Amino acid sequence: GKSTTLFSRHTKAIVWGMQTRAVQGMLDFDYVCSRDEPSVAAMVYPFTGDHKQKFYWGHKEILIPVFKNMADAMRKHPEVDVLINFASLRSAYDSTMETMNYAQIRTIAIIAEGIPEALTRKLIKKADQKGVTIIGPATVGGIKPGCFKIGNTGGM
C-alpha cells in the first residue's frame, strides 16, 4: 500500500549523485522553514570512496557523509524514507531497481530526462508491487512548504 503523507518535518533523504548544489538548496530550505534537522542524511556517489562533504546549515557548517555503495548508506541510516535519484538517463533504471529492494525507502524521486518507456514501465510495475511512490521521471521534483523540498525544485 502507498502512503498518504510522503513528506514531513522528520523526513530524511539519501541523494544519489554528486549534487552538492541541490543538497545545499535543500538545507537552505530547511533552515528557512525553521526545521530541526537536515533533509539529507547521506549521498551516494559510486565513483569515489566514503568521505564527508561540507555543507551549510544557516551560518553553521555541517558534514554529510558521501558513501560509495547504497547498502552502506542504508545500513548507517535507517530513518531515511525517501531517495532522490539524480542519475542520468542510462543509469537511473539500475539505481531505482537497486533502490526498490530496500524496505525503508517509501518514496523515490527520479530526475532524469529521457529514460526509455519500457524501462520506466518496469519501474512503475515494481513500484506498484513493492508499494513505493515514485515521483515520476523527467521531473524537477516536488516541494512541500514547511517540511521538505526535492532537490532543485523552487530554484534559488
Binding site: K54, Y56, H59, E61
Partner: protein, 274 residues
C-alpha cells in the same frame, strides 16, 4: 572583510584542520592549551600524541614514543639517507636542503620496515593463524618477513636497542599480544638461523601497533587507520631527522669539500653507438 565582520555573506572554507588552533589568546594543541601542555608535564611524546593522534596518551606511551624517537635517530653515515644528507652538505647547500635530500629516501627499502613490519604482523595476527603457520606461509611466496633479522647481533649477542625497547614494552605496558606473536615468530626463526632476531624496525612496528590498539584512547578503527595512513613512517622520519641534522652540522663543522665519487667505482656499461 566588512561584509563578513557584520556577517551577511557566507563562504565555504577549505582546509578543515582538526589540529592546532593558532587563533585566540593561547596556542591550543589537539584540544589542550600550551600552558596545560607544559603544566601536565608531557614531553615530546605527549605533543606527538596531541598533534598526530589528537589524543592525550598515557604517561608510559609518551615515554615509549620518546624512546622510539631516541633509537630511530642516527644509524651511522653509511646508510642511504645519511649518505644523501652528507653529499648535500658537502655541496654547501643549507640545512633544509640537506635534511630534505636525505629525507627523500625514506621509502620502502630504507626506513620502510617500520610500517611494513607492522602491516605484515597485523595482517597475520588478525587473520588468526599461529606463528608456525605464518612463517611457512611467508616461505612459499618469496617475500621475507619484514622486521626479522640482523647482520651481526644474533642470539647470545642481543641488539641492545631492541632490548631496551623490549624491556620497556614488557614492564610499563599492559596487554601486548602482537609483540608476543612477533616473539613467537622470533623463537621459530632463531631456530633456522642464529641471526634472525627482531629488528628495531620490526619491534617498534609491532610494539606501536600494541601501543595503539592495546592501551586506551583508540577503539580498533582509529588504531588501524593510524596504521594504514602512515603514522609509523612519521616515527622513523622524525627520529632520523635528528641524525640527519647532526650529519649536516658535522659535515659543516669538519669543513669538507665537494664530493666527486671516483670513476673506478662506477663501471660504465653504455651501448655501442646509439
Amino acid at each position: 572583510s566588512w561584509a563578513r565582520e557584520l556577517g551577511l555573506i557566507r563562504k565555504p572554507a577549505s582546509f578543515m584542520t582538526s589540529i592546532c588552533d593558532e587563533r585566540g589568546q593561547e596556542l591550543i594543541y589537539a584540544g589542550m592549551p600550551i600552558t596545560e601542555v607544559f603544566k601536565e608535564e608531557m614531553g615530546i611524546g605527549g605533543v606527538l600524541g596531541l598533534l598526530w593522534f589528537q589524543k592525550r596518551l598515557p604517561k608510559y606511551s609518551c615515554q615509549f614514543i620518546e624512546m622510539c624517537l631516541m633509537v630511530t635517530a642516527d644509524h651511522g653515515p653509511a646508510v642511504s639517507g645519511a649518505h644523501n644528507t652528507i653529499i648535500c652538505a658537502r655541496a654547501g647547500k643549507d640545512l633544509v636542503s640537506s635534511l630534505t635530500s636525505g629525507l627523500l629516501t625514506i621509502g620502502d627499502r630504507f626506513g620502510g620496515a617500520l610500517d611494513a613490519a607492522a602491516k605484515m604482523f597485523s595482517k597475520a595476527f588478525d587473520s588468526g593463524i599461529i606463528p608456525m603457520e605464518f612463517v611457512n606461509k611467508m616461505k612459499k611466496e618469496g617475500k621475507l618477513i619484514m622486521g626479522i633479522g640482523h647482520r651481526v647481533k644474533s642470539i647470545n649477542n642481543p641488539d641492545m636497542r631492541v632490548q631496551i625497547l623490549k624491556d620497556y614494552v614488557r614492564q610499563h605496558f599492559p596487554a601486548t599480544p602482537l609483540l608476543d606473536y612477533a616473539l613467537e615468530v622470533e623463537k621459530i626463526t632463531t631456530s633456522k638461523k642464529p641471526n634472525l632476531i627482531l629488528n628495531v624496525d620490526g619491534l617498534i612496528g609491532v610494539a606501536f601497533v600494541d601501543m595503539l590498539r592495546n592501551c586506551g584512547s583508540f577503539t580498533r578503527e582509529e588504531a588501524d587507520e593510524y596504521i594504514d595512513i602512515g603514522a609509523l613512517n612519521g616515527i622513523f622520519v622524525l627520529g632520523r631527522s635528528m641524525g640527519f641534522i647532526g650529519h649536516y652540522l658535522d659535515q659543516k663543522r669538519l669543513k669538507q669539500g665537494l664530493y666527486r665519487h671516483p670513476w673506478d667505482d662506477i663501471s660504465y656499461v653504455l651501448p655501442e653507438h646509439m
